[PDB]
Scaffold this active site. Structure first.
Site, mmCIF file in Angstrom:
data_model
loop_
_atom_site.group_PDB
_atom_site.id
_atom_site.type_symbol
_atom_site.label_atom_id
_atom_site.label_comp_id
_atom_site.label_asym_id
_atom_site.label_seq_id
_atom_site.Cartn_x
_atom_site.Cartn_y
_atom_site.Cartn_z
ATOM 1 N N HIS A 4 13.066 2.962 5.040
ATOM 2 C CA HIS A 4 11.592 2.926 5.104
ATOM 3 C C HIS A 4 11.060 1.694 5.827
ATOM 4 O O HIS A 4 9.945 1.731 6.344
ATOM 5 C CB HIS A 4 10.944 3.119 3.717
ATOM 6 C CG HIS A 4 10.802 1.877 2.884
ATOM 7 N ND1 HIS A 4 11.695 1.588 1.864
ATOM 8 C CD2 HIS A 4 9.858 0.910 2.922
ATOM 9 C CE1 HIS A 4 11.285 0.455 1.326
ATOM 10 N NE2 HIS A 4 10.181 0.008 1.917
ATOM 11 N N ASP A 53 17.033 6.269 1.053
ATOM 12 C CA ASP A 53 16.392 5.074 1.581
ATOM 13 C C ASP A 53 17.405 3.964 1.947
ATOM 14 O O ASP A 53 17.502 2.932 1.285
ATOM 15 C CB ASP A 53 15.292 4.591 0.620
ATOM 16 C CG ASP A 53 14.347 3.609 1.303
ATOM 17 O OD1 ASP A 53 14.383 3.517 2.559
ATOM 18 O OD2 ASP A 53 13.586 2.934 0.590
ATOM 19 N N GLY A 105 7.503 -6.479 -0.319
ATOM 20 C CA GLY A 105 8.015 -7.490 0.610
ATOM 21 C C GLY A 105 9.514 -7.746 0.448
ATOM 22 O O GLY A 105 10.145 -8.352 1.324
ATOM 23 N N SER A 157 11.626 -5.198 -0.063
ATOM 24 C CA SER A 157 12.248 -3.947 0.423
ATOM 25 C C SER A 157 13.430 -4.232 1.332
ATOM 26 O O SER A 157 13.341 -5.115 2.200
ATOM 27 C CB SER A 157 11.251 -3.114 1.230
ATOM 28 O OG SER A 157 10.279 -2.553 0.363
ATOM 29 N N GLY A 158 14.526 -3.504 1.097
ATOM 30 C CA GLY A 158 15.739 -3.610 1.899
ATOM 31 C C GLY A 158 16.741 -4.636 1.414
ATOM 32 O O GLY A 158 17.892 -4.628 1.864
HETATM 33 C C1 LIG Z 1 9.368 4.070 0.105
HETATM 34 C C2 LIG Z 1 8.156 3.406 -0.531
HETATM 35 C C3 LIG Z 1 8.075 2.015 -0.502
HETATM 36 C C4 LIG Z 1 7.045 1.324 -1.130
HETATM 37 C C5 LIG Z 1 6.084 2.053 -1.812
HETATM 38 C C6 LIG Z 1 6.132 3.436 -1.844
HETATM 39 C C7 LIG Z 1 7.153 4.133 -1.198
HETATM 40 C C8 LIG Z 1 7.106 5.666 -1.141
HETATM 41 C C9 LIG Z 1 6.660 6.317 -2.460
HETATM 42 C C10 LIG Z 1 6.206 6.200 0.012
HETATM 43 O O1 LIG Z 1 6.681 5.685 1.281
HETATM 44 C C11 LIG Z 1 6.087 4.564 1.745
HETATM 45 O O2 LIG Z 1 5.098 4.064 1.264
HETATM 46 N N1 LIG Z 1 6.704 4.151 2.877
HETATM 47 C C12 LIG Z 1 6.644 2.855 3.457
HETATM 48 C C13 LIG Z 1 7.085 2.692 4.760
HETATM 49 C C14 LIG Z 1 7.013 1.449 5.367
HETATM 50 C C15 LIG Z 1 6.573 0.317 4.681
HETATM 51 C C16 LIG Z 1 6.640 -1.051 5.393
HETATM 52 C C17 LIG Z 1 5.228 -1.694 5.404
HETATM 53 O O3 LIG Z 1 5.022 -2.846 5.059
HETATM 54 O O4 LIG Z 1 4.294 -0.903 5.826
HETATM 55 C C18 LIG Z 1 7.350 -1.235 6.772
HETATM 56 C C19 LIG Z 1 8.054 -2.477 6.221
HETATM 57 C C20 LIG Z 1 7.762 -1.965 4.811
HETATM 58 C C21 LIG Z 1 6.157 0.472 3.345
HETATM 59 C C22 LIG Z 1 6.211 1.737 2.748
HETATM 60 C C23 LIG Z 1 5.578 -0.672 2.541
HETATM 61 N N2 LIG Z 1 5.597 -0.444 1.096
HETATM 62 C C24 LIG Z 1 4.338 -0.027 0.477
HETATM 63 C C25 LIG Z 1 6.787 -0.582 0.468
HETATM 64 O O5 LIG Z 1 7.779 -0.954 1.082
HETATM 65 C C26 LIG Z 1 6.949 -0.191 -1.004
HETATM 66 N N3 LIG Z 1 8.147 -0.858 -1.476
HETATM 67 C C27 LIG Z 1 8.419 -1.159 -2.804
HETATM 68 C C28 LIG Z 1 9.710 -1.583 -3.117
HETATM 69 C C29 LIG Z 1 10.064 -1.896 -4.391
HETATM 70 C C30 LIG Z 1 9.126 -1.813 -5.452
HETATM 71 C C31 LIG Z 1 9.424 -2.172 -6.824
HETATM 72 N N4 LIG Z 1 10.657 -2.547 -7.214
HETATM 73 N N5 LIG Z 1 8.476 -2.146 -7.790
HETATM 74 C C32 LIG Z 1 7.242 -1.738 -7.489
HETATM 75 C C33 LIG Z 1 6.846 -1.346 -6.185
HETATM 76 F F1 LIG Z 1 5.597 -0.879 -5.935
HETATM 77 C C34 LIG Z 1 7.790 -1.394 -5.140
HETATM 78 C C35 LIG Z 1 7.466 -1.069 -3.799
#
Ligand SMILES: Cc1cc2ccc1[C@@H](C)COC(=O)Nc1ccc(C3(C(=O)O)CCC3)c(c1)CN(C)C(=O)[C@@H]2Nc1ccc2c(N)ncc(F)c2c1
Ligand SMILES: [Ca+2]
Lengths: 55, 254
Positions: B41, B90, B190, B192-193
């Site tokens: 992601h 992911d 922040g 992530s990864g």
């Molecule tokens: C896959 C995913 C990631 C995240 C939220 C939702 C989703 C799905 C449902 C939809 O998919 C997405 O929202 N996709 C997506 C794609 C790119 C970005 C990037 C950005 O900043 O836009 C590119 C670099 C990360 C981003 C999210 C940013 N972002 C919200 C995220 O990374 C967030 N990460 C975490 C990671 C760990 C978390 C944790 N342990 N406790 C609580 C959290 F809440 C967490 C959020």
């Protein structure tokens, strides 16, 4: 044997035909004569923290 | 990372910082001198594939102390089953353009064998998660690398211990929950990864990737991590493959 307490291995475990078990190690490690322990063969083996190891 | 502490410099030597156009993107984990494991992601919004940099030996973002090593990311390998904007599969495998040099401050984390990871590592309760992510939900990101100890849950237990919120994604066999439901401690977007690293008989191993959740350190919710053990064979086969032209590569999964 490998399912139970990692077959006594420090790292990897392979089950063999019968009650046989062979422990193995990740690259940068070698198996000791006890057949279970892994010792580093390189300066920076994976998963070890040098500042903590040098204490 | 919310509710953790500064990782003492050199104590998280496999931690990677990913940058795009010099800006903080995501975390990653070094698993040998040329390969980094991160989250698929993290690359959903990249357009400048040629300005992707991995930094090893990083600690404090405000100062250059000479332990940092920067490398261009030559390849980003994502499983064919990953769908942008979703949660499943992911994981990303990154090939560095030139190997990093191993030092006291740059060391790979062990990528374990699948059997060892499923039979043994999956039952180690606590593991460490780290990164330069948000220190608070809706707060600033960290200038020093942070680390947090989190307990792993069986998926049945995660679903039972969680708040039944609508439109929430499922926890698949390619994921696991870890952390706390009381809103005190978690990894954030922040982070992530970044690594979810498990200690076993004196050695650290890669078991999870900081993946997703429902708001950082939100009451009734746990952090969700990519279950790395499902990808061991997929990762090993790709690390034996020749590089291909173009940065992004979609590879069949399984
Ligand atoms: C896959 C995913 C990631 C995240 C939220 C939702 C989703 C799905 C449902 C939809 O998919 C997405 O929202 N996709 C997506 C794609 C790119 C970005 C990037 C950005 O900043 O836009 C590119 C670099 C990360 C981003 C999210 C940013 N972002 C919200 C995220 O990374 C967030 N990460 C975490 C990671 C760990 C978390 C944790 N342990 N406790 C609580 C959290 F809440 C967490 C959020
Ligand atoms: Ca620095």
């Amino acid at each position: 044997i490998c399912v139970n307490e990692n077959g006594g291995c420090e790292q990897y475990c392979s089950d063999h035909t019968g009650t046989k078990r062979s422990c193995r190690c990740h690259e940068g490690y070698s198996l000791l004569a006890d057949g279970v322990s892994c010792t580093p063969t390189v300066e920076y083996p994976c998963g070890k923290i040098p500042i903590l190891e040098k204490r | 990372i919310v509710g953790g502490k500064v990782c003492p410099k050199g104590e998280c030597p496999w931690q990677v910082l990913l940058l795009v156009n010099g800006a903080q993107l995501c975390g990653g984990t070094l698993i040998n001198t040329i390969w980094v494991v991160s989250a698929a992601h993290c690359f959903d919004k990249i357009k400048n594939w040629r300005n992707l940099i991995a930094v090893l030996g990083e600690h404090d973002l405000s100062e250059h102390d000479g332990d940092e090593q920067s490398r261009r990311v030559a390849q980003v390998i994502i499983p064919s089953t990953y769908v942008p904007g979703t949660t499943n599969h992911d994981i990303a495998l990154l090939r560095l353009h030139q190997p990093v040099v191993l030092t006291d401050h740059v060391v790979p984390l062990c990528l374990p064998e699948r059997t060892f990871s499923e039979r043994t590592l999956a039952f180690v309760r606590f593991s460490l998660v780290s990164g330069w992510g948000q220190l608070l939900d809706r707060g600033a990101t960290a200038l020093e690398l942070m680390v947090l100890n989190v307990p792993r849950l069986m998926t049945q237990d995660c679903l039972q211990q969680s708040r039944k919120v609508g439109d929430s994604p499922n926890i698949t066999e390619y994921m696991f929950c870890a952390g706390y439901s009381d809103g005190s401690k978690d990894s954030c977007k922040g982070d992530s990864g970044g690594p979810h690293a498990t200690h076993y008989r004196g050695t650290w191993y890669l078991t999870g990737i900081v993946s997703w959740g429902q708001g950082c350190a939100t009451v009734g919710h746990f952090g969700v991590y990519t279950r790395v053990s499902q990808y061991i064979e997929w990762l090993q086969k790709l690390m034996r493959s020749e590089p291909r032209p173009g940065v992004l590569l979609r590879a069949p999964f399984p």
